[PDB]
């Protein structure tokens, strides 16, 4: 049999009957009869009397707790009872489910919660993804603040980045005290991130004072552990919008569901015990007699009761009676004063609902920081390379940048390459911040009656501020999108099999040869095709029967013998002939380059950066670092 106890809510008589009803709900591999009790008020004598009478007159094997109005100093009495009577209990909700670290030696409490350091790990995870690193610590005079101040410093040395700490302040935030001193202390600070550890009443006092002394506007950010935040179903005033916390799984379930989970855990533990020895141990509830030295039978049962799984949710308890490896969920206050999920956490990898931290304001219209922008690009092997993150540690290998191929659900790849290194250097010199996202539609650009796809389209319709990568320059593009100075010069080039004296050769000028009709490349919807069509009609007419999937299949077709000539960009073609199976080659060489242009950073018209980042590109080109990048990323064997 099992026991159930309620506390301090709207009187759950109907809920008590609902819990009592399913004596044979059959979802558990056992048939232990359930029963219920309920205490009117919460107090030492009341709780002691009810539990002692119940287990001494009922012969129960396990008891499951259910918490109350969230008052402290309640878990201690339950640990006392467990240590004395050697009867395992289990908490599911409320303030009793707050980790009591140095529990009594011979007891079995098994409260479901998360330790302070483990709960701080997720906070330092979310700080890493947005790269804030300000670390203004505020902790009230609470009996547990000495542990928080040590745990933060302990986790500070268990991570990669330096975590430059700014200032740690302890202020008397109780009911009675001098408000002026704390006003002076809070008014004298400057740090774009704050982490505070207080209690609910202390949290309200602190946030009211902070709102008084201008630290709650759209500039700063707050983070608090789950000890604060109260009810989670009644956020009070003076709570800043954007307050972040990390609550555990099942922060939205029902009380009956949580009691059901507790009974499921007890039943699974007992059943797993039977598959080894085959009997549920007899009770020991002599509350009045208080006997019992160390008992190996109940010790074996408890040792067996630690680990348990249930259809996706694993509840693995540590020696200390707090579960290890849970699936925590980050929550934040939406713009309408309503808690909402932001980021999950499963198996040491963090996720986020937004690629940026949405930042609010007093009138609630959201603003974007001036030193911020959104960059678009897509895949081209010499310049932009996409790699899925390895299973090593969640984050991507250093000297790589997180990038996402948008289309709401996302998978965070990371991008590496030439233009990405240029972008990193630019972000380091021009003092700005960026987020990089790939494109979905056609590769580079086109105009199907004003419907511009690609990066050019993404810039022309004001959804981005730059577009970096393999993007050439021509008259029709530069009409609507601006451009910086070039940094890699390209053109048109012909690759052949290892036979022509240029484009104006009669083999390309006159497609009227009888036995051999030459064959062409021209990956369509691209850069060169526009020029080739607009300047040579007959070549365009004859060029329909040309291989067109990528710069990948063309190499295979040329090596096979189904194509006689390939026409494409210069910087990619002459590199493709660097490391090749054997040595296929192009015509005379850089002397054969047609319509010599270069790559460029596309920008929005009349953009204040254009002048900002043209000078930086010129400076980089001047001193030869570009040559080092060229010899690191653009070298071949043949």
């Amino acid at each position: 049999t099992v026991a159930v106890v309620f506390s301090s809510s709207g009187p759950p008589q109907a809920q008590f009957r609902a819990r009592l009803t399913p004596q044979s709900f059959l979802d558990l591999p056992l048939e232990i009869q359930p029963l219920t009790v309920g205490v009117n008020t919460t107090n030492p004598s009341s709780l002691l009397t009810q539990i002692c009478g119940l287990l001494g007159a009922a012969h129960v094997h396990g008891i499951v707790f259910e918490d109350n109005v969230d008052t402290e100093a309640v878990a201690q009495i339950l640990d006392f009872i467990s240590s004395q009577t050697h009867v395992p209990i289990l908490s599911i909700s409320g303030g009793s489910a707050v980790v009591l670290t140095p529990k009594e030696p011979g007891s079995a409490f098994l409260q479901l919660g998360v330790s302070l350091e483990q709960q701080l790990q997720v906070l330092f995870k979310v700080l890493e993804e947005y790269d804030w690193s300000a670390f203004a610590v505020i902790t009230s005079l609470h009996p547990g603040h000495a542990l928080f101040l040590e745990g933060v410093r302990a986790v500070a040395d268990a991570s990669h980045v330096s975590w430059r700490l700014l200032d740690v302040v302890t202020l008397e935030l109780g009911p009675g005290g001098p408000r002026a001193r704390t006003q002076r202390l809070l008014r004298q600070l400057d740090a774009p991130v704050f982490v505070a550890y207080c209690s609910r009443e202390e949290a309200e006092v602190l946030f009211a004072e902070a709102a008084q002394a201008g630290l709650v506007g759209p500039g700063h950010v707050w983070l608090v552990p789950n000890l604060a935040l109260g009810s989670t179903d009644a956020p009070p005033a003076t709570f800043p919008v954007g307050l972040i916390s990390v609550v555990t799984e099942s922060w939205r379930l029902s009380l009956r569901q949580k009691v059901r989970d507790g009974v499921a855990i007890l039943a699974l533990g007992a059943h797993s015990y039977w598959r080894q020895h085959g009997t549920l141990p007899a009770p020991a509830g002599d509350c009045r007699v208080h006997p019992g030295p160390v008992s190996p039978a109940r010790e074996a049962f408890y040792r067996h009761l630690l680990n348990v799984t249930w259809e996706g949710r694993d509840f693995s308890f540590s020696p200390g009676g707090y579960l290890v490896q849970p699936t925590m969920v980050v929550i934040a206050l939406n713009r309408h004063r309503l808690w909402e999920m932001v980021g999950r956490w499963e198996h040491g990898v963090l996720y986020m609902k937004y690629p940026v931290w949405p930042r609010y304001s007093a009138s609630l219209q959201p603003v974007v920081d001036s030193r911020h922008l959104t960059v678009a690009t897509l895949e081209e092997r010499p310049f932009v390379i996409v790699e899925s993150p390895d299973p090593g540690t969640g984050g991507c290998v250093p000297n790589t940048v997180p990038c996402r191929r948008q289309s709401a659900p996302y998978t965070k790849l990371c991008c590496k390459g030439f233009c990405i290194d240029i972008l990193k250097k630019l972000a380091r010199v021009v003092k700005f911040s960026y987020d990089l996202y790939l494109v979905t539609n056609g590769k580079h650009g086109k105009r199907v009656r004003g419907v511009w796809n690609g990066m050019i389209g993404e810039v022309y319709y004001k959804r981005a501020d730059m577009a970096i990568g393999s993007l050439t320059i021509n008259e029709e593009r530069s009409e609507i999108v601006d451009f910086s100075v070039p940094f890699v010069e390209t053109g048109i080039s012909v690759m052949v099999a290892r036979t022509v004296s240029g484009l104006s050769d009669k083999k390309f000028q006159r497609p009227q040869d009888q036995y051999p009709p030459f064959r062409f490349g021209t990956v369509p919807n691209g850069s060169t095709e526009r020029n080739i069509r607009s300047n040579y009609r007959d070549m365009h007419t004859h060029m329909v029967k040309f291989n067109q999937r990528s710069v990948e299949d063309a190499l295979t077709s040329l090596k096979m013998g189904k194509l006689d000539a390939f026409i494409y960009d210069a910087a990619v073609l002459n590199y493709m002939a660097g490391k090749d199976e054997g040595c296929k080659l192009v015509t005379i060489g850089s002397g054969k380059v047609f319509a010599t242009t270069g790559y460029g950073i596309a920008m929005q018209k009349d953009s204040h950066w254009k002048r900002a980042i043209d000078l930086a590109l010129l400076q980089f080109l001047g001193d030869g670092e570009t040559q080092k990048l060229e010899t690191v990323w653009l070298s071949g064997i043949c």
Binding site: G578, T631, S635, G636, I637
Partner: peptide, 16 residues
């Protein structure tokens, strides 16, 4: 020629 600065066979990985 396996140089010390950078060899294209060493800089760009090959098959053999």
């Amino acid at each position: 020629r396996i140089t010390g600065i950078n060899d294209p066979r060493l800089r760009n990985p090959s098959d053999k």
